[PDB]
Amino acid sequence: AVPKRRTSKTRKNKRRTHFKISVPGMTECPNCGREYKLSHRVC
Amino acid sequence: VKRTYQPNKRKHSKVHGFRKRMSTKNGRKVLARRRRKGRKVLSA
Amino acid sequence: MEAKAVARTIRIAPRKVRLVLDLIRGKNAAEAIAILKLTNKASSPVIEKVLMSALANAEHNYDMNTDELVVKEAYANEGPTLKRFRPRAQGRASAINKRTSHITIVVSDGKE
Amino acid sequence: RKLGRTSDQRKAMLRDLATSLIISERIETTEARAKEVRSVVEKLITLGKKGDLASRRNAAKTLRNVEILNEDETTQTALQKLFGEIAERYTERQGGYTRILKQGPRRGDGAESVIIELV
RNA sequence: GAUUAAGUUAUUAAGGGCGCACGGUGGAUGCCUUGGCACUAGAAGCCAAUGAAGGACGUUACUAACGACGAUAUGCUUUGGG
RNA sequence: ACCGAUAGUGAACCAGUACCGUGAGGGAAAGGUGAAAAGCACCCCGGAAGGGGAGUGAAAUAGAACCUGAAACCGUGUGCU
RNA sequence: GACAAUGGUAGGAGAGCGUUCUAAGGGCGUUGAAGCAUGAUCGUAAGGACAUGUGGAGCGCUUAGAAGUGAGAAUGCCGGUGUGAGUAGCGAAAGACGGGUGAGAAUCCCGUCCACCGAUUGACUAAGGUUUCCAGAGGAAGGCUCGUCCGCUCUGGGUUAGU
RNA sequence: CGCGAGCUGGGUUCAGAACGUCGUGAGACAGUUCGGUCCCUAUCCGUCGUGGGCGUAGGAAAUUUGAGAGGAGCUGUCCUU
RNA sequence: AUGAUGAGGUUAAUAGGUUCGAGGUGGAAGCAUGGUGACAUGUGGAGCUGACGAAUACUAAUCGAUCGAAGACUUAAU
Ligand SMILES: [Mg+2]
Ligand SMILES: [Mg+2]
Ligand SMILES: [Mg+2]
Ligand SMILES: [Mg+2]
Ligand SMILES: [Mg+2]
Ligand SMILES: [Mg+2]
Ligand SMILES: [Mg+2]
Ligand SMILES: [Mg+2]
Ligand SMILES: [Mg+2]
Ligand SMILES: [Mg+2]
Ligand SMILES: [Mg+2]
Ligand SMILES: [Mg+2]
Ligand SMILES: [Mg+2]
Ligand SMILES: [Mg+2]
Ligand SMILES: [Mg+2]
Ligand SMILES: [Mg+2]
Ligand SMILES: [Mg+2]
Ligand SMILES: [Mg+2]
Ligand SMILES: [Mg+2]
Ligand SMILES: [Mg+2]
Ligand SMILES: [Mg+2]
Ligand SMILES: [Mg+2]
Ligand SMILES: [Mg+2]
Ligand SMILES: [Mg+2]
Ligand SMILES: [Mn+2]
Ligand SMILES: [Mn+2]
Ligand SMILES: [Mn+2]
Ligand SMILES: [Mn+2]
Ligand SMILES: [Mn+2]
Ligand SMILES: [Mn+2]
Ligand SMILES: [Mn+2]
Ligand SMILES: [Mn+2]
Ligand SMILES: [Mn+2]
Ligand SMILES: [Mn+2]
Ligand SMILES: [Mn+2]
Ligand SMILES: [Mn+2]
Ligand SMILES: [Mn+2]
Ligand SMILES: [Mn+2]
Ligand SMILES: [Mn+2]
Ligand SMILES: [Mn+2]
Ligand SMILES: [Mn+2]
Ligand SMILES: [Mn+2]
Ligand SMILES: [Mn+2]
Ligand SMILES: [Mn+2]
Ligand SMILES: [Mn+2]
Ligand SMILES: [Mn+2]
Ligand SMILES: [Mn+2]
Ligand SMILES: [Mn+2]
Ligand SMILES: [Mn+2]
Ligand SMILES: [Mn+2]
Ligand SMILES: [Mn+2]
Ligand SMILES: [Mn+2]
Ligand SMILES: [Mn+2]
Ligand SMILES: [Mn+2]
Ligand SMILES: [Mn+2]
Ligand SMILES: [Mn+2]
Ligand SMILES: [Mn+2]
Ligand SMILES: [Mn+2]
Ligand SMILES: [Mn+2]
Ligand SMILES: [Mn+2]
Ligand SMILES: [Mn+2]
Ligand SMILES: [Mn+2]
Ligand SMILES: [Mn+2]
Ligand SMILES: [Mn+2]
Ligand SMILES: [Mn+2]
Ligand SMILES: [Mn+2]
Ligand SMILES: [Mn+2]
Ligand SMILES: [Mn+2]
Ligand SMILES: [Mn+2]
Ligand SMILES: [Mn+2]
Ligand SMILES: [Mn+2]
Ligand SMILES: [Mn+2]
Ligand SMILES: [Mn+2]
Ligand SMILES: [Mn+2]
Ligand SMILES: [Mn+2]
Ligand SMILES: [Mn+2]
Ligand SMILES: [Mn+2]
Ligand SMILES: [Mn+2]
Ligand SMILES: [Mn+2]
Ligand SMILES: [Mn+2]
Ligand SMILES: [Mn+2]
Ligand SMILES: [Mn+2]
Ligand SMILES: [Mn+2]
Ligand SMILES: [Mn+2]
Ligand SMILES: [Mn+2]
Ligand SMILES: [Mn+2]
Ligand SMILES: [Mn+2]
């Protein structure tokens, strides 16, 4: 099986609308001044 | 599986060496043809 | 005024870098360095070093305070692709495109 | 009750971890190995905490070999440490004594790194 | 009460489309020519055991490649030109 | 009243060379900063790469992969939808 | 001025548009040529101007000459870039942690444990290959990931016979 | 003669081989016999599952009506009368 | 599969551990004994026990961030 028609620009991008990545869930380290992921070590 | 061309220094130097080319009139025609074309390398 | 910096011919291919920038784009600068440091993709350290440079030029060449700075824009553009191949079955070999990204970014003050 | 690879390999890897940690009070690993290995190393510290020769033979049935850690200039064996200090550390304490802390992703493969220390 | 009822409409854009701006890639186009191509007029039309053709290896402060030269090597002499 | 870099010799670039074949043999691609190298002292982020200022230059939005820089194709912004 | 005729494939006829070169004439051009871009511009068509932007040095117009004179299709030839798609794949196999090093480590160095072949995955040599061997540096590309690492890169150095 | 990008491949349609038969022959079938490479990573529709977006004129939480749609729908023997 | 559903997130039994237990196996180790021994018996339904059931905050569900209303017009009805 091979595509019978090429994918459209507009088509291809409509498909890509669920392809983002998540903004990380990120608590601020107290007093250390860096930042880190939720429920992770403060390094 | 054994692919063709198993290298041999002797067998390649004989049969395709400057000498063996010299040995027949045709070989000289060969070196002539190559010398005409200007190949950097003639006989092996 | 509103300073920028660029990283030309970064080895990472543009679709990927765009996945990161899109998180970065528009946010306040501080937040951006955080998000950048916390995302786990290659482009994250690269874009990091680039936003740092841009902040540097902005403090140093334009005398603005860094804190109020904002990421006005950031984007990656196609840059020339290194062209390779991998050998395949039955002696055919098919192409591989190792493409590259130019990463621009621009920080900001007000209109003036 | 997790995996990574095949059961023999998981057994071995799990001894290899728990024999360590005891050597080294804290380690860094995947979150996954850490969860699986918290239980192993805890069951060992209860085994040493018992003290009888029987328990000793069961531990040594699980624990990996000589690892004679250099203390203040001497060589406690591995299990010899386990029954010898670790057990005398946690005796007034209940069982339940091990912790895992989340490092965040590692570069090469993205694996979630975490640290696991017994205290 | 916007309350009850009956009816009528709207805002939303995850994303998309048309238009526009600004960039990137790519190397068309224009311009250019050291290289070719077809001929004219005249010289010349052979070289070789007194070892050619064509090469290999060398030769400079540094030297890989090309040319140039050869253990007298990145040249020696000589008569002229400059 | 021939070509002007896909043309004209295969070859305007160290071409019968890269490369392919045991061999005879087959055989490419690849020209252009500027008038002058004046080829970006210096500062800055960076391990470098690269980059923003400061500069040379008529021009570097002529910066070396360098005249012009089309179309495909990739993107950021959005007026209407 | 009335009056007629004007669908059209193979094809016949006719009249034209535009390209490059040439002749002569008349001009334009660093106070900016061509080319490229953008525009609501004019002609019955091919097509012609014009303004702005870019560019930075060559061009038009008139008449006549002559043509390597007009592309959308040849599974056409060469170049670029897509689509498929963040998809298939990453080439037989056990690895774990500690300590280094570094800008940066699952991947390099050390260590410990673990495991694997053992008529061999060991040891030696003929072919064949020709600097891949060694030491110090390096990390853009090569390595199917990463790389401080290498059969990769730079500099230096390595092969000794009367038997 | 539903269904080989779902499976098989025994029949029949290649190359080897043999018998009968025909042809002088090379060969051939109106015949028989033993043997004999089944490729494809699903783009669109379709179909089975399964989430997001907006809508449903405030924002939510639980309970619901059922327009519609789907499923099931088979049958013996024996006792009694 | 992922996401979705559901149980929990310290004012907490959500998992791990811990301590009991069901089920499972079938008589641990060490020691004593009897044997020339291979072994047998005893101490002893012993010891061990992944998912199953209880109790217990011993370890980890920490800090925190994001999203989410202010209720259109018309006409008839108090
Ligand atoms: Mg010989
Ligand atoms: Mg000879
Ligand atoms: Mg890389
Ligand atoms: Mg082939
Ligand atoms: Mg796996
Ligand atoms: Mg209503
Ligand atoms: Mg609303
Ligand atoms: Mg929109
Ligand atoms: Mg429209
Ligand atoms: Mg000429
Ligand atoms: Mg051949
Ligand atoms: Mg014209
Ligand atoms: Mg003009
Ligand atoms: Mg790097
Ligand atoms: Mg061997
Ligand atoms: Mg590298
Ligand atoms: Mg078969
Ligand atoms: Mg058979
Ligand atoms: Mg098959
Ligand atoms: Mg998700
Ligand atoms: Mg419970
Ligand atoms: Mg339980
Ligand atoms: Mg329970
Ligand atoms: Mg209001
Ligand atoms: Mn998109
Ligand atoms: Mn040749
Ligand atoms: Mn030789
Ligand atoms: Mn092959
Ligand atoms: Mn086994
Ligand atoms: Mn959006
Ligand atoms: Mn858009
Ligand atoms: Mn003559
Ligand atoms: Mn003679
Ligand atoms: Mn010569
Ligand atoms: Mn030479
Ligand atoms: Mn002189
Ligand atoms: Mn050109
Ligand atoms: Mn070869
Ligand atoms: Mn020049
Ligand atoms: Mn620095
Ligand atoms: Mn620099
Ligand atoms: Mn200047
Ligand atoms: Mn280019
Ligand atoms: Mn020029
Ligand atoms: Mn240019
Ligand atoms: Mn363009
Ligand atoms: Mn757009
Ligand atoms: Mn007509
Ligand atoms: Mn008509
Ligand atoms: Mn005609
Ligand atoms: Mn012209
Ligand atoms: Mn126009
Ligand atoms: Mn003009
Ligand atoms: Mn033509
Ligand atoms: Mn075409
Ligand atoms: Mn092509
Ligand atoms: Mn994916
Ligand atoms: Mn992947
Ligand atoms: Mn797919
Ligand atoms: Mn898949
Ligand atoms: Mn895969
Ligand atoms: Mn492999
Ligand atoms: Mn390590
Ligand atoms: Mn360090
Ligand atoms: Mn090692
Ligand atoms: Mn073995
Ligand atoms: Mn064997
Ligand atoms: Mn040899
Ligand atoms: Mn080789
Ligand atoms: Mn080496
Ligand atoms: Mn790599
Ligand atoms: Mn059929
Ligand atoms: Mn068959
Ligand atoms: Mn058959
Ligand atoms: Mn055939
Ligand atoms: Mn007969
Ligand atoms: Mn839904
Ligand atoms: Mn409501
Ligand atoms: Mn219901
Ligand atoms: Mn119904
Ligand atoms: Mn019914
Ligand atoms: Mn439990
Ligand atoms: Mn006895
Ligand atoms: Mn309680
Ligand atoms: Mn909270
Ligand atoms: Mn209301
Ligand atoms: Mn109304």
CATH number, domain containing residue B38 = 1.10.287.3980
The string of DSSP letters for C16-66 reads: HHHHHHHHHTTSBHHHHHHHHHHS-STHHHHHHHHHHHHHHHHHHTT---S
Beta strands in chain D (DSSP E): 26-30, 69-70, 75-76, 99-105, 112-117
Considering only residues 33-92 of protein chain C, which place a Cβ less than 7 A from any atom of strand F? 49, 52-53, 56-57, 60-61, 73, 75-78, 80
Report d(CA D99, CA D14) in Å as an integer: 17
> Nearest CA to the C1' of G106 belongs to which residue?
D108
Tokens matching residue D50 = 């018992």
Residue B1: its H or E element: none
Supply the angle between the helices D7-22 and D31-50 in degrees, to the nearest 10. Answer: 60
Phi, psi of C102 (to 5 degrees): -95, 120
Question: Length of chain D, please?
Answer: 119
Report d(CA C103, CA C5) in Å as an integer: 8
Domain positions in chain A are 2-43
Helix (H, G, I), strand (E, B) or coil at C72: strand
C1’ F50 / CA A13, Å: 31
C1’ F39 / CA C21, Å: 35
| Integer CA distances (angstroms), B43 to C70, C92, D109, in order | 72, 32, 55
**D touches A, CB cut-off 8 Å, minimum 3 pairs:** yes
Task: Name the residue range of residue B15's domain.
Answer: 1-44
Report d(CA D8, CA C105) in Å as an integer: 52
| Integer CA distances (angstroms), A27 to A30, A39, B27, C51, D54, in order | 9, 8, 84, 21, 49
Residues of A with CB under 8 A from a CB of D: 36-37, 39-41, 43
Look at the block and give the residue holding tokens 């290659």. C42
Residue whose C-alpha is closest to residue C55's, from C86, C85, C15, C24? C24
Q: What's the number of domains chain B is made of?
A: 1
Domains in chain C: ranges and CATH: 1-112 (3.90.470.10)
Domains in chain D: ranges and CATH: 1-119 (3.90.1030.10)
Residue whose C-alpha is closest to residue C69's, from C78, C87, C79, C57? C57
Q: Which residue of A has its CA nearest to C25?
A: A23
